[PDB]
Every structure is written in C-alpha cells, then in structure tokens.
Write a sequence for this structure.
C-alpha cells in the first residue's frame, strides 16, 4: 500500500505505508495517521505530512532558536498549529505557554503521535485555549505561527509582542519556491526590523522554510551559547545547526537581498 | 506524463515530464533525457537524476571546496562518473584534469545536456581516459570519486595522492541513511587523518552525501576566503555554504564521533 | 515513463509508454499520441484512450452490427466522434457516409494513428462536414453517436432517421456502472421501440458499453449471416461475437429488464 | 490510500483503499485483505486480486459450467487454489469434493472473506487434504485446477479422470495474451479430445482465461438447459453467459484452430 503528497504541481512523493491507524475529520480539519517502516508513523494533517520519526527536528529547531536568542522567556504564544512537541521543547525553559487551537477534536487525536503529549497537556504552565479571546491579555516574548500567516495575521500578532519580542513563522522552501519565500519576507518586513529566512539543515524531507522576525533581536548575533549548552535531552539542535540554518547560496542572497532585514 | 525516482524502497518522487528527448544505451549504462517545464531538462542515468538548470550547484560545491582549501591545483583526478561540469568548474584554476570513464558512448551522450560540454572536452589540460592504466604515473593534488567507493577502491586511489592532497567522494545522505554514512566514514578513517561528512545546503531534491578526506588538509581550518571571493561568476558556492555543509545534528555528531577526523 | 487514466473515482490505470509522438490542443479538444510497447500507439483524446493495436475491434463491431442487421445501407451518419476507422469498415458496404466533426484540427491530427486515414478521407462517398447544417438534408439508415448522447441529442438524431432506421450509440460498461447504463437505456427507450445494451466481447480494456436502438429492427433476430460471411478483411467480427455481445448475467438482466426494449 | 495490481509489465490498476484488514504470511504464501468503498473487501493473494462482493461470478461460472454439462456429479477434485466459493457452488449438487491445499494457515485465513466459509468446510462431503497422496485412490467426474498447469501437471491429473469426465483449468486472457493461451491449448490438445478456451463475460476487471477440456463431453453440445434453469439462487450464471463464454474473435478462432478441439 502507499499514499501520495503533492509537494509541487509537477512533483509528488509516494510513501509506502503498512497501515492506517487513525482517521478523524472535523468541520474544519482532517487528520490521518499511517504506520511507516521508514518514519514509524506518518500523520497527514490537511495535505501536509508529519513524520513521528523526526518530530524532534523542527520542534527542537524553532523552540531553541527562539529560546537561545532571547534573554528572557516568560510568556510564549503558539497559534495556527497542532504541534505540541514545540511546546515540550519550549518548556525546557522557565516559561509559560499559551496554545491557541480551536480544533480540540483534531488536537486530542494526536494522543499517541506526539511522544510528549501528556507531559505537555498536563503542564501547570501550559494553558490551551480555543481562541485568542479566551486568554488573559498581555504581551509575549516569543510568538509562533505554524502556518504561513498573511498580512493581517502578521499585524494582529505583532501588537501582542513585547518591545523585546521575537516572531518565528512558517513559509515555503527558499530555493524550490523562492517566489513564495520572497513574498513571505516582504510581508514580514513591513512591520519587523529583522526578517530572516532559514531552513532545517539536513531535514531534506519537506518543501518548508521559516522566517525569524523581530524588532531588535538578531538570530545570529544574539545567540547565547551558554543557553544552548545548558539545554538537556536535545538530539538535533546545537550551535552548528543554528548558524547553518541561515546559510544561503550566492544567487539566493541576491534574490532576497532587500527583503532580508538582517 | 510522469517518471519516477526511488529515493527509498518506501519513498518515491514523481516528476511530470513533457517529452522524452533521448534514449541512449550501452553495455554498462543507459541514459534517458526528459524535458520538464520547471527543472529544465532532467537526465535519468541508471535511475539517478540530474537537473540541467541546477548542475552548477554540485559542480561548484565540489570543485571549489577543493580549490579554496588548497594552495595550488596542478593535477586533479576524477573517476567513476560523467560529471564534466565538475571539471568545468575546476578549470577556473590553471590545473590539469585526468578524467577516467570507460563508457565513451554515454559520456558523449551529454553533448547537449552539459552547457559547458565542448569547452571542457577541448581543454588542452583535460585528459579523457578509458581507464586508470592508460594514464601517466603521477600524484594528484585532489582526487574526486563520483560514486561511493568501497574500502578497496579507497586504498587504491589513496596512494595516487600528494602528501597534502584531498580526496572528495560521494556517500549516502546522513539524515535518512546514517548507518551507511557511518561505514563510509570508518572506511575513510582507516587510511586518512582527516575525514569529514558534508552535504549540499538547500539541495532538498537529493539523497546524496559527501566526504572530504585527506592526510592533513582541513576543510575549514585551511579555507582560503580570498580564493572564495575571487569566484565572482559562480552562482551558488560561497563561504557560508562551505562551512554550513559540515554542520551535523547533535545526535549525528555523536554517533559519527569515532569515525570523523578533524 | 508512464501515463494514467481514471476509469473510476476509485480506480485508475497506469500505462508504461516509451515516448510522446504528438500534442495538439484545440479551442475545444486536446489530443496526445503516445508510443506503446503493448498497444503500439495510445491516443489520449480528452480523458479517453484509444489503442492503435485494437482499432479494428470497436470499428468492426459497430460498423457490422449495423451493416449486417440492415437490409439496405445507403446513407450513414456519424456525429460526436473522430473515429474514421468506423468509416473504413462501413465502406465495406455500398453506402454513403456523412461524418460530422467540427474540430478539423484534432481530426486531421490522426493522419498516422488511423491505419485507413487517407483511404477514408479520399473516398468519393465520404463527405466530411463541420456541422449538421453543412449537409443536404435527408433521412439515414444508420446513425452513430460516438459519445453518450443526452435526451436532446437523442431526439434531434431520431427524426433524421428512416422508418427502417437504426441508431448505435455509446454508454458506460453495464456491470461496472449499471446505474449509468440504466440511465442511457431509459433515455433511449423514450423514443425507440428497440433499446438493447451490448459490449465488446474480450475487449477487457475499457469501461465502455453500447446501445443498439431502433423502431423495428432487432439486433439478434434481424442478423443476416450471409452479409456477415460476405465481409472481407475482418479480424474480429463474426456471428459468435455479434450474438455474444448481447449476453447479460442473470442479475443484470433483472436490473435492466424494463429498460431493455428487446 | 492505494494499492496496485500488475495486469501487465506496462499496465497497472490502482484501487483506492480505506483500510487494511489483514496481513497473514506463510512459508509459501502471503495474504492481505483491504476494505474498498466500492468492491467491498479486496483480497490480495500473491498479487492476484479477489473481490468479496463479486466472488460469485467466477465460482458460479466454473462450478455450473461443469454441473450443467454433466449427467451426475459424484466425485470432484479441486487443486492448486483457495477457492472455497467454487466448492460452495458445487455443493448445489449432491457430490463429494476433494480439496487439496497444503497451506492451511492461508486457507483458514479466508474465514471472514468467504461468505460461505463455514458451510463449505463443515460439509460431510468436503475433504480438505494437504496433498494428493493423503487422498483415497479413485476417479473424478470433474477436476478443477485453479492455477495454470504445465504439461506435466496435466498429464498427472488427466489420469484421475473418469472416461466421461471434465477438466477445467485457468489460463491467460486470449485478448492480451493469445500466445500464452495458444500454448495452454496445445498442451491440453495433447491428451484431450476436447479443449476449448472461454472467458467470464462482463468480467472486465480480470486478465484471466480458462479451458474446458475432456475426453468427449462437449461444453455446448452436452449443455443441459434444465439444469441451468433449476439454479434459481445463482446471481450470474445462465445459459446466455455459458455459450457466450466460448465466443472467439475471428482472428483468434483462426490462430487457435489447430489446438482447439470440439
């Protein structure tokens, strides 16, 4: 048996799977978990794949890129996603996390997919809310957007940010789809003094990119090695990966030159 | 119309193709070239894909990682492959290049696929040999193996090296095939004082890895930035990409610790 | 390389092809010819396949099912199709043929696909017209509809029919899609006293069916063996295939019972 | 989710599947059962597909072509297969059935797939043997080979036949694999006075053919319509389907002329 994902209008991927473990459709989302001989378990969340085998990669990368570049981490915000592993890694810091996901049904259906599901859901500092209006208002130190946000989502989130604030969001892969990344950066630049694209080194499995945005916090210059070396039980993240994540070939640097708010 | 690419026994890539441009076949190799509306022409060599519009990435990376890490390039050896674009990039240096490939028929089949085909083959300093035995006896400043060599091939090429020479070869990607990479490193660690794995940053479309091995030349410590900046016409290679290529996830740095040599 | 056709929302077919020989899109149709090791050449005409290898099967079947059941064959009409092979088989009778196809571009693009292209286009009795209004008006002895016609197309064609008239049209396969065939028959029954479904015995390659409609001509009882045995250069059609074409399993006979105007 | 079926080295069928229901495996066979939203459950036995909702077609056809062409059914032999639905249909007659299949594990694996599983296995007159040698010595009125037998297997079963017995076996479809069918006929023509090929009408989803061979019983001339009409609970088999199964295209009647025996 096999399943397929379109990573491009001219490129698909075929995955051999040994079984279908779960299926839960919602009035807004559809999730399906498959058993994989390669990735252990593959979760298909609305035309996007998640490999149980490599949940530590993106979770460790985003969480610690934020954590190790911020002097103070007390309030975090995570919108537009179901990734509780990000949360598990962020808790390796002394911080509070506000998770906003309206789709409980889908979210709870990850009960076995995410290794640290319970450890995250039962954290005293972890508060899960259906929507934004369900949270005490305040300004955060780090905001995460799990789906490429638009100009509005960007603005709405930028005001909920502290002067010191940092915003890490998702976009397409800078090489495969430089035009998408270019647009994602332009949007980010409109309100942030620091807008820089990066990727997950060695994570050769997804057409995905990311942007590190802020008002006055540089992702390379404000990296604090001591916070890095102090982290425990990390299997992917380190300083080499962090810096390498921002490497760009010659041409691409030229292409994103003025959209890159370094 | 589509073609496929087996990155793994449980994972495939599918490229929409507009036409088949060539179908050549020898006693040892078969080569097909297709037209894609996005990746330009795609060449399928023994189920290994080559992209015309992106040939420069791997050629510049491999050639210049060598050229910018060595004082002078006088004698270079290329074996087990058909990559004329690598020699083209190497000809930026005033060096001689010995190119061994018994399959003339397939090699010349690249007359249109390689944009610098004729320029490379007409170089006074380019020697195409059917086999290593037809070559003059001598040592090389740098040797390139375009296929994963077994420990016996390594032993053989190893001795055709100058004391300060560099041996660069291909291996499997360390993310999806760490066990393979590991073995590729121990086989190198056997006769070389330096043996470090690296990948091609931003190249998400390939399940391929490489090793920089030598007797004492260091891929990072012997890096000559002046040589890197002199390369004004390259489109991919730069210092950031050079260093970034050696970055390893924390767990891979650890599993590879024993075989890696700096 | 390969191509794919959806024969069902839950069933597709994958065809290995060695090359793409032709591509001509029209302001109404799209045609693509592929070279096949199995079928010689595959023509993809707007989501439907044609196998050069087996053009004699359907052409011989429809042409002679009409021809050998009609006492007199002098005027024939063919609408909604590009199949000139039907025409080649019908000319094995002393009859005139009116081919109505507005898309000359696509039609002419079959120049090499249809074995008897020129022999049919240059027949003195073959008149090709862009539309119906481009033909002398008259009543025909046999009408062929190459695409499942609707209630209107059915009526419009039924009046252009002689008292003795016969109408052979296309529909889905009676077993795989009994609901479609059921509808096709109901429509036909509304105006014809004789409506009977049939298939191409042994032509296990398509989700296709056909209906033999008329006012007073039975496809099994009015079959004239002498006209059959008199036909020359036929490789598929004979009396066994003709009668077998109307065989229906027990259940299906019950399903189509009152829609079958035998 | 999809699975595939290789009807030809250049042709494949792809079925959308909702779930995998079983994965059994023995020393000689592997069996997987899937749930399809249309064909009910699909069983994949050594890359040969079986459809639960349509098992009756082949079982009724094979059993009753024999039963309605013989005076009395007292001893029947089934070999080289797992088709219990064939025996079920044969039990409409008061006959004994010897069923040989060394792979008990896989056979019993059909406990839910075959709707009449238990009824067939609990029949006092059904004997399941691991091999032909564990059986009592005797002659059969009818023998069924569920796999294409080579000329050696034929020779062997041939002798376990009553003088007026019938040997029915599987072969390749004569439309796509005429050469194969041809050979299957000459091998039968070798020891049998009657040898005629036939297919399963309206069964477009299978690349399978069959042969009715005997010493003198004729599949059409010895057909007993009374026996056919007595079968009021069958859903497919009837006289029209019986005769229609032997119909051959004009060119196949000719190429097969020498090996076919009536």
């Amino acid at each position: 048996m096999w399943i397929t994902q379109e990573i491009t209008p001219y490129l698909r991927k075929e995955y051999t799977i040994e079984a279908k473990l779960l299926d839960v459709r919602s009035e807004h989302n559809i999730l399906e978990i498959f058993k994989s001989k390669d990735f252990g378990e593959i979760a298909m969340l609305n035309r996007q794949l998640l490999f149980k085998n490599f949940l530590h990669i993106e979770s460790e990368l985003l969480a610690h890129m934020g954590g190790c570049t911020k002097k103070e981490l007390k309030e975090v915000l995570i919108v537009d996603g179901f990734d509780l592993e990000l949360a598990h890694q962020l808790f390796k810091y002394d911080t509070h996390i506000d998770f906003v996901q309206a789709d409980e049904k889908i979210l709870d259906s990850f009960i076995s997919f995410f290794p640290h599901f319970h450890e995250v859901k039962n954290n005293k500092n972890f508060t899960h809310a259906k929507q934004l209006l369900d949270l005490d208002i305040k300004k955060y130190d780090l905001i995460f957007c799990l789906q490429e946000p638009d100009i509005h989502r960007i603005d709405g989130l930028k005001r909920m940010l502290k002067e010191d604030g940092v915003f890490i969001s998702v976009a397409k892969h800078p090489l495969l789809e430089h035009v998408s990344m270019q647009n994602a950066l332009k949007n980010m630049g409109g309100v942030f003094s620091v807008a820089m694209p990066f990727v997950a080194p060695l994570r050769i499995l997804s057409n995905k990119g990311y942007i590190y945005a802020s008002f006055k916090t540089h992702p390379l210059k404000d990296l604090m090695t001591p916070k890095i070396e102090a982290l425990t039980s990390v299997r992917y993240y380190n300083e080499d990966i962090h810096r390498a994540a921002f490497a760009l070939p010659k041409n691409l640097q030229e292409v994103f030159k003025d959209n890159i708010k370094s």
Q: What stands out?
A: Chain B has two domains: 1-51, 52-262. The longest helix of chain B spans residues 55-67. The longest strand of chain B covers residues 161-171. The two ends of chain B are 48 Å apart (CA to CA).
